A paper describes a structure:
Additionally, the final product is often contaminated with side products due to over oxidation and therefore requires considerable purification efforts. This manuscript focuses on a cyclohexanone dehydrogenase ([name]), EC number 1.3.99.14, an enzyme which can perform α,β-desaturation of carbonyl compounds with exquisite selectivity. CDHs belongs to the succinate dehydrogenase/fumarate reductase flavoprotein superfamily and use flavin adenine dinucleotide (FAD) as a cofactor to perform the dehydrogenation of cyclic ketones. The natural substrate for CDHs is cyclohexanone, a simple cyclic ketone. The SelenoMet WT [name] crystal structure was solved using single wavelength anomalous diffraction (SAD), using the selenium atom as the dispersion centre.
The resulting [name] variant had overall improved enzyme activity and substrate scope, i.e., accepting the bulkier carbonyl compound, dihydrocoumarin. A DCPIP colour change assay was used initially to assess any differences in activity of WT [name] and [name] and Y195F variants on cyclohexanone and the eight other test substrates. Activity was observed for (i) WT [name] and the [name] variant with cyclohexanone, 3-methylcyclohexanone and 4,4-dimethylcyclohexanone, and (ii) the [name] variant, but not WT [name], with dihydrocoumarin. To study how the [name] variant made the [name] enzyme more promiscuous, we performed MD simulations of the [name] variant in complex with native substrate cyclohexanone, 3-methylcyclohexanone and 4,4-dimethylcyclohexanone. The MD simulations revealed that the [name] variant contains additional space in the active site to accommodate the methyl groups in the 3- and 4-substituted cyclohexanones and the fused aromatic ring of dihydrocoumarin.
Author numbering:
A (entry chain BBB): 64 to 598
B (entry chain AAA): 63 to 598
């Protein structure tokens, strides 16, 4: 038996849990939110809280249609490229993927509107944020879908903190109970196999059992920080990610005897990371969404550019895991970001995972030297320090010569404004996350400027990480966790990164994690409200 | 509820894992049944060459070829976990589990092979020339010698699997192992203490049968290549299928979903290029493309440019096909086009090892043909159109013809000097080793290349990425015992072969690197299962 009882028990206090809790409470249920950490907010707290809301009221107010068939074609084209077909009944998606994407379109705006109306998540529009693949002809609403917390800073970097504040303030105002230091570790079933509550491990190592009359809703985030799970499931061998450190995939263990379908386990939301911060478990670390610097290139261990440094983070991270079967190594396992004094002075940022950081910031990851040859010596020392993580990678014997050639070639591209090798700056999204730069009259392309012929020169190692994972128990479009016959496990719900995303390995646009997540919190809460009170 | 039959040991699947597990079990004196889902025995194993890679095997020792254990471990460690391999680390940078599993392979494969041969179940011959796939690594101290093959396999060895299933199943029958075909196991039955006490299987006629196991249920049920949902949701690359038996649909993943197991290595398969049209068309006789045929032959992408060494090890080459172009939201190499001339048609064709170049009389529906290169590109275009819904509506670039001419001029230079400046074709031993048949040419500096003909006819085939089978599933210890989430055996429950987690990660060490380890674990599993008390 149990020491407490509520209509709805919510696990986790990021976006998925707080919104699920609020929607549940507003239907009149009693609700508790159980949080494993000492503080609320999880990864959501660290985010910019961009949220991508199709057919939102700001768009409609501007007379911008977001036609539903074209919304589905955009997400289908990006999510399942090989199979996308406009003439196919579900656009080449499976029925489940199609229905999930449809649910996002149907429910995101009503969810966003209700949260705002109740003062839980007031927003402003981000009209100029373009979708990450807006150039595709399938995208018929290329900008307009993004919302952000109303009181977020101009950079929006603190959006997640603002959102956790407004969400949790409304939750307290409306009588939702909170318990921190409660690590849920078990779902309790009745004799009919229905979820009737949880067991949680407390700080002092005692367990408590808490009954849920109607539903247990998991919003417990991903598994980035269980290295075993991460390594065994993800399609790339990432070194970590900006996910909260308490996101260790507990739901995967919780459901291991429940007969669930683990889906999309092979995918994470990907991003490059400041490699030394991932290895060193810096909890304040962000994914490198904006690769800082215009007088800045990435080179491999041969001293050559291999990629557009301004490419969308979810795609750029994948470059780091290209495999060289002939040499039995990952040639790009870490890349080296190299920049000059101009970028140091005018492109530094504490936000969006920039490796270029302003005076006073933690600079332990920054490598520095007065010559290019000196820099390579310093980079070598850094590679040696982390040898056991990166295959004992070394700079090639012709590194310095190749680097000089790479800088000369790039400097040409920066003069003409045309990167003939990797097309840096030619897609809108490259400009979108370009970061701060020193204004230069008659810079031809804002993403490039010639690297100075004098030092000092700076560098940082860039490795591959996650925002968090996006695989877990499969749900229906109402957030109900399914058994292997696709039938709900009665009373059991999941929302957010702890369950399977329908987005496969794709990242549609800024806010493509939180926008869908709010839609499903709303659908989950609406369904959970309809549950009979049991046991 | 009750059971309609009872045995000491119940074995699920009749490929290598199941037959060997069953035989070892029976020879300890247990009663044994083998439950096979299909109408026929043998699974993927039946289709294989039955190369099996057996470290420190008796033929090697008899020939005076050393295979020191510490160096064996460094070879497999270096290949398996490249980022973390470290000769100074106590487990070489592997996890304790991976290290222990690799050690078990070295310790147990040879005694397993010896016993199966002694009993006449798997007589073998040595294949002294079969060389490891990364033989150039200094860690490999026994670069050749580890491979065995069924004694009566053909000279090419291509029917080895059929011979092995014949000798194994004949011995099994001889020694009183029971067989039930058309029995699709779908559930493990537990007692009140949560121990495995038997199975439920679905029969062809849709009746269900419950069969008690006194000591152990051993799964040898193969991988999940042919469950598209599981394949698509777990593997690190979006493969189109594979040469796995079509009945390999990952049943064990569903069976164990309520048993609290740890699914491990789910992100990896044994990978290989495939003749794309045979994967899409579900040709059950299809083999992975283990040798890419032809010396006067190149692979081009849809731009008409070479992108890869066509002679690269199959498990590595397959990965090239899934390179991702984030800027264009496409897989640039999703299919590559193998193009060859009459010389390669005549002298490199093969019915074996997944060759796209096939001799007269072989099924050649996948072969595209034209008298001119310009005609060939028109023919290739029609083929891409036919499969548009599978390959992102990929098209040849508008400058395909001109690029191809340039690619062939470049390659023809490389073929005459013997030096492929772009992709180093022929510079690693395995490129030469798996090069396939070629017309002997006195003037040839590099056996893997010869100039492409200045006249037609020309031939082409689409190449896509596939599997041999998957290699993730419930984690076992080195004794084949399926573990719960606290790393403790689920009593009575065993798994061997592709249905459980391989310790090889995404790596393919050598020819026979699936079957060799597999026999080691069948032996260890059977030895442990024999030790189980009789229960329920
Ligand atoms: C495709 C292929 C693979 C291959 C090869 C050549 C080809 C064309 N050559 C190889 C080689 O020479 N050496 C080597 O090491 N590997 C080679 N491979 C890979 C290899 O064939 C496989 O790794 C290996 O044979 C797998 O053996 P295993 O015993 O694990 O699996 P199987 O042979 O596929 O048999 C599984 C059987 O189980 C039955 N099954 C499936 N589900 C059920 C249920 N529910 N109940 C009962 N039986 C079930 C399948 O029907 C199958 O028969
Ligand atoms: C720096 C950064 C910036 C980002 N910016 C954006 C952005 O602007 N827009 C966007 O769409 N996405 C963004 N993302 C991704 C986004 O933050 C996440 O996808 C989203 O916040 C996940 O929310 P969630 O509720 O699923 O999980 P989380 O916010 O991670 O919350 C899960 C919570 O569950 C708790 N928990 C875990 N296990 C248990 C247990 N056993 N019992 C109890 N509680 C448990 C955790 O401690 C945690 O508090 C960003 C990510 C990062 C790292």
């Amino acid at each position: 038996s149990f020491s407490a009882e509520y209509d709805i028990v919510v696990v986790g206090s990021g976006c998925a849990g707080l919104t699920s809790a609020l929607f549940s409470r507003w239907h009149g249920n009693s609700v508790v939110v159980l949080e494993k950490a000492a503080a609320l907010g999880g990864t959501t707290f660290k985010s910019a809280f961009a949220y991508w809301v199709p057919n939102n009221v700001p768009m409609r107010a501007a007379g911008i249609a977001d036609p539903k068939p074209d919304f589905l074609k955009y997400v289908a084209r990006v999510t399942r490229p090989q199979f996308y077909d406009p003439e196919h009944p579900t656009l080449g998606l499976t029925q489940w993927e199609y229905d999930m994407c449809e649910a996002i379109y149907d429910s995101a705006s009503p969810a966003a509107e209700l949260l705002a109306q109740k003062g839980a998540l007031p927003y402003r529009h981000v009209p100029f944020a373009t979708d990450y693949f807006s150039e595709l002809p399938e995208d018929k609403a290329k900008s307009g879908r993004v919302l952000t917390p109303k009181d977020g800073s101009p950079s929006m970097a603190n959006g997640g903190q603002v959102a956790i504040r407004t969400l949790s303030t409304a939750a307290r105002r409306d009588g939702i109970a909170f318990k921190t230091g409660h690590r849920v570790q078990r779902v309790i079933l009745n004799s009919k196999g229905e979820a009737i509550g949880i067991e949680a491990l407390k700080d002092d190592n005692s367990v408590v059992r808490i009954r849920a009359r109607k539903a247990v809703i998991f919003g417990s985030g991903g598994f980035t920080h269980d290295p075993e799970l991460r390594s065994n499931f993800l399609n790339v061998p990432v070194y970590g990610g900006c996910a909260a450190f308490t996101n260790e995939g507990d739901l995967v263990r919780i459901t291991s005897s429940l007969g669930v379908q683990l889906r999309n386990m092979n995918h994470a939301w990907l991003c490059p990371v400041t490699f030394e911060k991932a290895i060193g478990r810096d909890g304040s670390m962000s994914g490198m969404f904006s690769v800082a610097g215009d007088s800045m290139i990435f080179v491999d261990k041969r001293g050559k550019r291999v990629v557009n440094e301004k490419l969308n983070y979810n795609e750029l991270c994948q470059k780091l895991f290209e495999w060289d079967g002939a040499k039995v190594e990952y040639p790009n396992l870490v890349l080296i970001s190299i920049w000059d004094q101009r970028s140091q002075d005018h492109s530094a940022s504490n936000d969006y995972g920039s490796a270029i950081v302003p005076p006073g910031a933690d600079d332990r990851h920054v490598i520095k030297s007065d010559t290019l040859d000196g820099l390579s010596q310093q980079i070598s020392l850094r590679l040696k320090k982390y040898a056991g993580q990166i295959g004992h990678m070394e700079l090639s014997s012709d590194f310095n010569a190749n680097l000089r050639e790479s800088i000369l070639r790039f400097n040409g591209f920066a003069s003409t404004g045309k990167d003939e090798d990797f097309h840096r700056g030619e897609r809108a999204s490259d400009v979108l996350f370009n970061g701060s730069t020193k204004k230069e009259p008659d810079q031809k392309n804002p993403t490039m400027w010639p690297i100075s012929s004098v030092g000092p020169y700076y560098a940082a190692l860039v490795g591959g990480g996650t925002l968090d994972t996006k695989g877990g128990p499969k749900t229906n479009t109402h957030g109900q966790i399914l058994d292997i016959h696709d039938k709900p496990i009665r009373g059991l719900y999941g929302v957010g990164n702890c369950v399977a995303s329908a987005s496969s390995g794709a990242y549609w646009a800024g806010g493509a994690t939180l926008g869908p997540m709010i839609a499903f919190a709303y659908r989950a809460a609406n369904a959970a409200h309809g549950e009979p009170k049991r046991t």
